[PDB]
């Protein structure tokens, strides 16, 4: 396997990667800015190095050349993105290919397909999935109305670069469509720099369904059943859910089947997920496909008892899903599970974060309890 691996991330995901690497007997290297010298992940690795200048701690992690140079100096063989930061930036994959360092990810070509959006949709019409109406991305209001004159209303006007639930508006008619579209364009331009907003048919009372896909290099795709993320606050994920209750078996079977067909058609080589929305009458919409690992994978890890990060690392080393034992006749969920996240947001004054020094910490545990990420007394 790999002799050494560098993790270009921060937080609990770095510690999870370190634990997975230690389970596989692989050395670990960490990089930190000056302002984050007191983080725990610095002391959990075999070697640590400082990157960036004396300012802009966030920009330090978004520097491909510096990380590549540090990995080359430390004699690393692989780079693990994690989630966030440069986890979906094709420049990192190109730079890794330009050197002798391997990149833990699907492929360089797959990363280009998932960024601009709606060419995923072009790939979904071709692969033959249930797909929704897609609007032409345009920052102009007259053009958007000329396309909107033939729509089933109401309509969601969504930022083109918007992702997560940041920058969409529901309009019940076309009379208020132009002001709404102008506001959305201004917000998208101020947020992500692209003033283009696209419309979409607004499906009533939806439920959000996630399907996890695992695939190796030579080509073999398996699914790890569904999840549920219906509980959201301002379109942000709040509480995770076990396999989705009140769901018939035919529904889940055909979701898994067309998800796996799309994944096989798309030429995937790593872990990832596909998203669907299900309505009162029941239909599949294929919102998008996230080509990385989220913070909710642990939930499926509790039902299918299959390791994700270690399997990902072994797949990046050139192993198929045959010596790993991940074949689809012994994978069956048993039990239910759920996950929650604890933050410093105050539910009293807005929801803004609060900063301070921790003066008391008491954890918990027992039967059926798993904890990820842990601070210490006196931390800032």
């Amino acid at each position: 396997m790999f002799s050494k691996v560098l993790v270009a991330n921060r937080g609990e995901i770095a510690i999870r990667a370190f634990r997975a690497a230690y389970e596989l007997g692989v050395g670990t290297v960490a990089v930190y800015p000056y302002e984050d010298r007191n983080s725990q992940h610095r002391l959990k690795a075999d070697e640590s190095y400082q990157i960036g200048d004396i300012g802009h701690p966030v920009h330090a992690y978004l520097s491909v050349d510096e990380i590549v140079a540090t990995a080359r100096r430390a004699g690393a063989d692989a780079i693990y993105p994690g989630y966030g930061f440069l986890s979906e930036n094709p420049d990192l994959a190109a730079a890794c290919a330009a050197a002798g360092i391997s990149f833990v990810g699907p492929s360089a070509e797959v990363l280009e397909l998932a960024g601009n959006k709606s060419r995923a949709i072009a790939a979904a019409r071709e692969a033959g999935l249930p797909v929704l109406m897609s609007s032409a991305p345009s920052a102009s209001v007259d053009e958007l109305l000329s396309v909107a004159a033939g729509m089933p209303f109401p309509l969601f006007v969504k930022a083109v670069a918007g992702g997560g639930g940041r920058g969409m508006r529901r309009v019940g008619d076309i009379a208020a469509l132009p002001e709404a579209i102008e506001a959305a364009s201004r917000e998208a331009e101020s947020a992500f720099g692209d003033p283009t907003v696209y419309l979409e048919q607004a499906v009533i009372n939806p439920r959000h369904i996630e399907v996890q896909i695992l695939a190796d290099n030579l080509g073999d795709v398996i699914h790890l059943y569904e999840r549920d993320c219906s509980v959201q606050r301002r379109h942000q994920k709040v509480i995770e859910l076990a396999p989705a209750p009140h769901l018939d078996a035919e529904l889940r079977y055909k979701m898994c089947v067309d998800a796996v067909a799309f994944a096989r058609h798309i030429g995937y080589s790593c872990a990832g997920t596909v998203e669907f929305l299900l309505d009162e009458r029941g239909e599949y919409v294929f919102i998008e496909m996230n080509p990385r690992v989220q913070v909710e994978h642990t939930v499926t890890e509790e039902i299918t008892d299959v390791d994700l990060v270690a399997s990902q690392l072994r797949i990046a080393a050139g192993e198929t899903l045959e010596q790993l034992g991940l074949r689809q006749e012994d994978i069956a969920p048993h039990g239910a599970a759920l996950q929650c996240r604890i933050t410093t947001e105050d539910p009293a004054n807005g929801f803004r974060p609060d900063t301070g020094r921790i003066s008391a910490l008491r954890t918990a545990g027992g039967a059926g309890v798993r904890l990820d990420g842990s601070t210490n007394l006196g931390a800032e």
Binding site: Y22, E23, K44, E47, D307, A379
Partner: protein, 665 residues
Amino acid sequence: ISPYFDSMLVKLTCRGRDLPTAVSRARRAIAEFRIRGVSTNIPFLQAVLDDPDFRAGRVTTSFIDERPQLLTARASADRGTKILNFLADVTVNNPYGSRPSTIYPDDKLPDLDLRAAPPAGSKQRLVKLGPEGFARWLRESAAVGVTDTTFRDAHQSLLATRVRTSGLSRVAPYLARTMPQLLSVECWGGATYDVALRFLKEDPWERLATLRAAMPNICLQMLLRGRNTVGYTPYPEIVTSAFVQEATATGIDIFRIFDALNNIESMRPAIDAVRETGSAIAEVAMCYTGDLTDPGEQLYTLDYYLKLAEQIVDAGAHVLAIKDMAGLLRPPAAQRLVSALRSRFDLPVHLHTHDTPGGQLASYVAAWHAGADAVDGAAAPLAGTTSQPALSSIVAAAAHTEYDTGLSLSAVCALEPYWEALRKVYAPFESGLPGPTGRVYHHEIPGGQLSNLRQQAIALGLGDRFEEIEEAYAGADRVLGRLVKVTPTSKVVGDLALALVGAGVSADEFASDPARFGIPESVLGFLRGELGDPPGGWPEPLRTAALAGRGAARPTAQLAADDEIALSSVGAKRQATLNRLLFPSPTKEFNEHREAYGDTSQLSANQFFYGLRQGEEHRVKLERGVELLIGLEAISEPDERGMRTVMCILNGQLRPVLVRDRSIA
């Protein structure tokens, strides 16, 4: 922990698809867990989890029959806890009182790209041509080679040889990359060995290795003292040969060899050992005393030095040097001596002197105008008084002349603020004189001893008047008949002046009743004749018959066969055996300290000597990529015992340490 119930701390359960996965997960869990404060049975569990039979599943009631599972030892080798213990002990029990704001010299270093390889220097040339070719090149070169003595001979005469390795190692790369034209650097030997073993708890060999790695393009020079290498007593030949071999192996390029009383057969084995290596340079030095230009100088005349030099050349010397330790060489003496030496022989000449009377650079200017090839220089913030002449003056005195050294003057000036800050840090150990003294012409004393003499006369009685020690040193020197002292015969005369002033002997009645005094044993050992013979002659036609009927001389035990066995191989074992054979008691103290408190040679002067303060954060480098961040939080007043609790911060985590306050007893 409550001594009433069971010792149960935590139950850990690990699960998996199969047994090997659960075992790997348990191994990772038990490795990540950290408990400090009490002794834990973690290593036994780790040994049990790493048994191939246990992984295979051949479990049986008699699984424990295998013995070495129990005593696997290697508990933790915890370095952070020992560093914290030592730091807390220093903080609570610091002998030095209050202090000004902390000074950081590292902020004064100039900006420079420490990534590019340094340009080739004298080590490349010495490797390419060898010793003979290097000597010929130095003789035939119109430039005058400058040697740097800031690392050894500067803080020895001003700061009691108490500068640690951190500052030298921090400043060596800049010296190697702004000044690639220095002939050699003196950074080892003399009194640094004993002080490093005794007062600083460091290993000199590690210092030599660090300095070698730091500077790869400049030769390194070491001051050997003939039979007594770094000690104060004669040593057997095998020890000296082993020491030369180890030192040339670690990276010592040049050996400067002298003797207290200038005579051959006391330095021949060292010269032969240096010449046997085939990659080192031997520089034999003649000690200078008196004033030969004086009409009435009937003992230390030009012919004496000329025959000394003839013998040295017959003995196979690669470089010939003149050693002035008190600053008694005048421009005309130096001119005539250098001219005669250069015209009689065909060897390069090295000049070394101290600046006690002031303005000794003139001597250098008179020497290189007549044939001198190389000179020595100390950096300006640590120059003058009892130290060596400034380097900037030496570089500026030959600029735009046919004797140009080629050293940039801006580059040499750019490093002064760091030396200033470093000297400001070493405030409690300051021993420099007010300025230049004229009196040295009457009571000639080496510059390195005068500071300790001033401190001894401050702290051991008469301190308001210092004359008595001066004319007492003069009288003691005249009694033994004009001795040539540097290290060995300096301390005997110092002790004799001490006893003379303490016994009321004005100037001469000591030679009347020697048997009615408490003469120091170093003086009897001088009179016995193990340091050789005096140049002028034995001063005892009436002093003592043989020894004044004291007794006999103590025997010497032969080395044990295992030591001779270990002296033949190269490695850390030979270095440890030399350390124990040279200075037993301080190396045993150093070994105990290193066992107790790990490795503390990576600390700075401020942490090592003072301790920890509140509001500041310290970075201590353990390994490449392994660094520790240490700070302080609070201190509690002592309980009914003498015990206090100090709350500190390590890697952003709170740590209580229990310490003993020896002040309240």
